[PDB]
Design a protein around this ligand. Structure first.
Ligand SMILES: Nc1ccn([C@@H]2O[C@H](CO)[C@@H](O)[C@H]2O)c(=O)n1
Ligand SMILES: Nc1ccn([C@@H]2O[C@H](CO)[C@@H](O)[C@H]2O)c(=O)n1
Lengths: 302, 301
């Protein structure tokens, strides 16, 4: 009867690529995928075996409902997602070829994921084993979550260099933060020129109250640091990359899930890297063969 | 108990525009609309009051189903549209700004609208009052429709200069064709430099067996020609244009509907221009397209 609550954005990623001249309806291939940091994390959690509830917002349009339906039939409990009237479901348009040419994001219904909304589900939220939130939601909403978590661990996905900032004044209310290099630099105000700077950055995070830091450094790997003193590097699982999208989402799901499973920090980080690799090796934004079994198999195969 | 059958493509048009440049997550606005020539025509027919059945193809994906649902309580009977497994629903991606920049069409699922499929609905098709087909479907499928229409008038939308050509060898099996300038030039092999050339083009169409020609000339207007001798011009309803998509779709719906209503050719053409205008004045289908509101637009001349 243990459930996980994910609070974030649910999107539709539309990817189009040609077989290219401008001012012409050029024949190509278009894919509709389910996306959104929060939604993706919820789905990866469900594929990891946890009972996951999504608290998101989608429009009164029909395509929103089919986003919810697809997600529900991925295993996610979507029956508390807010269907918002009059406004259209958010989306991530993306023009590729072979290398993305351009991308557009329409994500303002995220501001409908309000404090009043979450307050309507206060007790349900406060009786989860862990709450996962992304920084796509408004500063007020994130503030409400962190203010009303009732000692339920909040895992936060910073999303981008632009949207991580709302987290800076609230690191003492966050159980685990997973920033990349740029996001960590943006938050700390300290340059991460190289691997010699992670200690100083992490020390900045810990002095500002962050319980746990999971710092993805790209090729450098993952540097993890606990305010109680434990820290270390984990070198990347070397992989066959085909997509890069859904990497961090899978890693976040891995961290939250492993936490719920009672796993220690370091091994949870390694496992999360396993998840991220599995995501990196799959045509879609989420890998439907993400499961405890084959990430574990990817990890013992070291 | 009179129904109309529309056989064509059902798409999802996704339009995105920013507010600006490249290699970056650019904040903007994205719109999902229901589209596809056939589907649009069916919807306009339903808004005109006719009982319209759509014979189209959509993927096993969920967004296909939401296209179908949206279309259904737009008034269209979609319960015979083919849900095709394994393949994804066709779509029209379009990158704009303030002026259309680039566009992609993924429409290979149109090839699932097969002869076999339509043959599974032979009798239902053959007892409609009129069949509307677009040239997005395969040459074989259009050939099957025209070969098995059982004297039910087939109205054909040429769609584009690229796809109108499959109609060239079969103008004698078509009740009404609605080409634009470029499509007419492409079909006839005769240049339409100016308004003095419509006669020779139309004569070419009639000599190759076309019963009725409805030729949209843009600013020049609409030239209509009947193989039995009636022909004429109709000047445009002058309008407040905000988008242009769904114009020809609305006109085709107007022609088919007016035909079913027993209206004469010319008056049906004028009415159809009214419909196309109503479409031109609404951010692909106008939900206030109706006999009332078109007649009001036309009597207001
Ligand atoms: N500001 C943004 C940008 C992107 N996304 C979603 O993130 C997914 C890939 O991680 C993509 O599926 C995309 O929809 C998001 O939630 N917020
Ligand atoms: N080859 C094509 C190109 C476009 N379309 C559909 O036509 C509508 C505008 O008339 C748009 O909604 C678009 O989806 C089509 O059915 N086939």
């Amino acid at each position: 009867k243990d459930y996980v609550v994910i609070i974030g954005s649910a999107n539709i990623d539309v990817a189009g690529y040609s077989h290219l001249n401008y001012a012409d309806s050029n024949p190509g291939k278009i894919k509709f995928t389910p996306g959104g940091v929060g939604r993706n994390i919820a789905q990866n959690l469900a594929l990891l075996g946890n009972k996951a509830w999504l608290l998101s917002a989608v429009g009164s349009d029909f395509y929103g409902q089919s986003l919810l339906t697809q997600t529900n039939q991925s295993g996610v409990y979507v029956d508390k997602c807010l269907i918002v009237p009059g406004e259209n479901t958010s989306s991530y348009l993306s023009l590729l070829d072979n290398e993305m040419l351009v991308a557009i994001n329409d994500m303002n219904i995220s501001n409908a994921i309000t404090a009043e909304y979450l307050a309507q589900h206060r007790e349900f939220i406060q009786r989860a084993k862990v709450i996962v939130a992304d920084c796509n939601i408004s500063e007020e909403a994130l503030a409400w979550i962190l203010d009303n978590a009732a000692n339920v661990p909040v895992f936060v996905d910073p999303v981008s260099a632009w949207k991580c900032v709302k987290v800076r004044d609230r690191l003492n209310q966050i159980h685990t933060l997973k920033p990349n290099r740029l996001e960590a630099e943006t938050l700390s105000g300290i340059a991460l020129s190289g691997r010699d700077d992670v200690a100083k950055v992490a020390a900045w995070f810990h002095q500002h109250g962050l319980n746990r830091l999971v710092l993805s450094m790209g090729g450098d790997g993952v540097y993890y640091s606990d305010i109680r003193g434990e820290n270390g590097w984990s070198a990347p699982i070397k992989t066959n990359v085909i997509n890069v999208t859904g990497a961090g989402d899978a890693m976040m799901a891995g961290l939250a899930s492993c936490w719920v499973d009672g796993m220690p920090f370091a091994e949870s980080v390694r496992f999360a890297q396993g998840c991220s690799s599995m995501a990196l090796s799959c045509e879609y934004t989420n890998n439907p063969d993400l499961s405890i079994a084959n990430v574990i198999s990817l990890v013992e195969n070291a």
